[PDB]
């Protein structure tokens, strides 16, 4: 249990914990909602995707599920939808 | 549209892009399923809240509102859930 | 702890637990990975919102903030992305 | 676009569009940022799991990767976290 006066601000400490290399996740929140996320590696769906650097995603191994429409939407530091696009993706024979 | 034949690997392009430091997300979707996520800044509810480099939350000006148990939850590196601890913040009056 | 033959389905009983109207959500996760999620009340981001019945978006106060574009994009039951569209809300002067 | 004055309510509405039962997901969102989110069907991260209908979860069928530890995590209708326990699915030989 944490107290802090209101109108000023509060940092609620993390017990027995060291922030590390090893740490990929910390999630903060209240109740059912998410307050703070932190994620230091990228999302993938399985272990068949990778996403690049370029932001580029790479299908590792290509099965007739895996067709259907990809889509792809940047976003900036300001977090304006940049891009927005859709792919195709088909199995060739 | 991309074709790409069945066992080998792919990359499908995002259409005319450049992977800027004003890229903060990149957002690679199989239709509603989420196949690949990019994003630098963390994920924050609002200005009110602010994660630490050490893990920690900022509450920048404390509510009544603010008040609750907050739920901190780390994750390594492999997956593994270490450490889920919950917080009681209560204002000070 | 759980035990379950290979091959064959597994059920994990989730404990002292009792499915009530009561409850809103119910997440499955191995490790930090999100397996079955279950939510009964849409998602909202603040108070200040509210979804409606036929999918539209309730900005009850509006707010200088408030402006800036916004994003429907509406799925199947199948999955696809059947609708995806942009809206500039701006405010009266 | 839309007008809307300072201060009052508006509703963005869904350029052409009918809310039916094949309808699934409604996503809102200004910019990067999640403001409403409606789904139907529940979150599971592959046809080899389905939530039921008392929360409990079912693997369709084992595999040496399905073992390990699950987080069942329930919430109130309000948001409080009743209930976060974990499981350890271990493959009986």
Do not use: C
């Not at 990809?70 to 940049?82: A, C, E, K, W």
């Amino acid at each position: 249990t944490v107290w802090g006066a209101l109108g000023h601000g509060i940092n609620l400490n993390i017990p027995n914990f060291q922030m590390t290399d090893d740490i990929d996740e910390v999630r903060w929140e209240r109740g059912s909602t998410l307050v703070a996320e932190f994620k230091r590696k990228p999302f993938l769906k399985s272990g068949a995707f990778e996403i690049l650097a370029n932001g580029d995603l790479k299908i590792k191994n290509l099965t007739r599920d895996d067709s259907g429409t990809y889509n792809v939407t940047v976003y900036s530091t300001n977090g304006t939808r940049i891009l927005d696009k859709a792919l195709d993706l088909r199995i060739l024979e």
